[PDB]
Amino acid sequence: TELTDARRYWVDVTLATNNISHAVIAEDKRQVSSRNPQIMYQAPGTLFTFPSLTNFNYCTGVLGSQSITSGKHYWEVDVSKKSAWILGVCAGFQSDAMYNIEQNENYQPKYGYWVIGLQEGVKYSVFQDGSSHTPFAPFIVPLSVIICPDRVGVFVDYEACTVSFFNITNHGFLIYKFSQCSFSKPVFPYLNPRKCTVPMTLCSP
């Protein structure tokens, strides 16, 4: 029901190539993954190695080719076999340096970030606003996921200022929903493999 009504605003979303992420967007702009060329042709010795220069973080964030400033929008993302990824809605990477967001996965709605993430394979969580005393760290909240989602549906109601996440694999049951979102700027669909080499696609009806 709630998912069927949201599917009424199904839009064709295409990724936009940016020069601030190490992500790899397909030619059709309908698929994105992680890993970068051979190995950044840098090989700290063992090629892939384990970039300790900043390990535990790859920094691969991408947005949509079209911005959202009104009306409702809905699109699905296929994260099958993926052990980690970040998807939802973003207002851009304008405030990514000030709070080393992408660098330290500092996703926060106050920074223009309304997304959810999965890590380790079975660790789902929702990024929320964190204490100002520690601006370089978000308030990650663990989500109770019983049926690992093989496809997530994102619904955005600019007018209502809300971002919902549906579990297509779970009868399309609601996973999380951002309410009273500060939609004062143009938002775009956020996607992030999260070091995960497994590509995340966007169905498209």
From Swiss-Prot:
Q: Which parts of the sequence belong to the B30.2/SPRY domain?
A: 2-205
Annotated TM spans? none
Which post-translational modifications are recorded for this protein?
Degraded in a proteasome-independent fashion in the absence of viral infection but in a proteasome-dependent fashion following exposure to restriction sensitive virus.
Where, subcellularly, is it found?
Cytoplasm; Nucleus
Task: Describe its assembly.
Answer: Can form homodimers and homotrimers. In addition to lower-order dimerization, also exhibits a higher-order multimerization and both low- and high-order multimerizations are essential for its restriction activity. Interacts with MAP3K7/TAK1, TAB2 and TAB3. Interacts with HSPA8/HSC70, PSMC2, PSMC4, PSMC5 and PSMD7. Interacts with SQSTM1. Interacts (via B30.2/SPRY domain) with HSPA1A/B. Interacts with TRIM6 and TRIM34. Interacts with BECN1; GABARAP. Interacts with ULK1 (phosphorylated form), GABARAPL1, GABARAPL2, MAP1LC3A and MAP1LC3C.
What family is this? Belongs to the TRIM/RBCC family.
Protein's job: Capsid-specific restriction factor that prevents infection from non-host-adapted retroviruses. Blocks viral replication early in the life cycle, after viral entry but before reverse transcription. In addition to acting as a capsid-specific restriction factor, also acts as a pattern recognition receptor that activates innate immune signaling in response to the retroviral capsid lattice.
The domain comment in this protein's record states: The B box-type zinc finger domain and the coiled-coil domain contribute to the higher and low order multimerization respectively which is essential for restriction activity. The coiled coil domain is important for higher order multimerization by promoting the initial dimerization.
Protein name (record): Tripartite motif-containing protein 5
Q: Which organism is it from?
A: Macaca mulatta
Originating gene: TRIM5
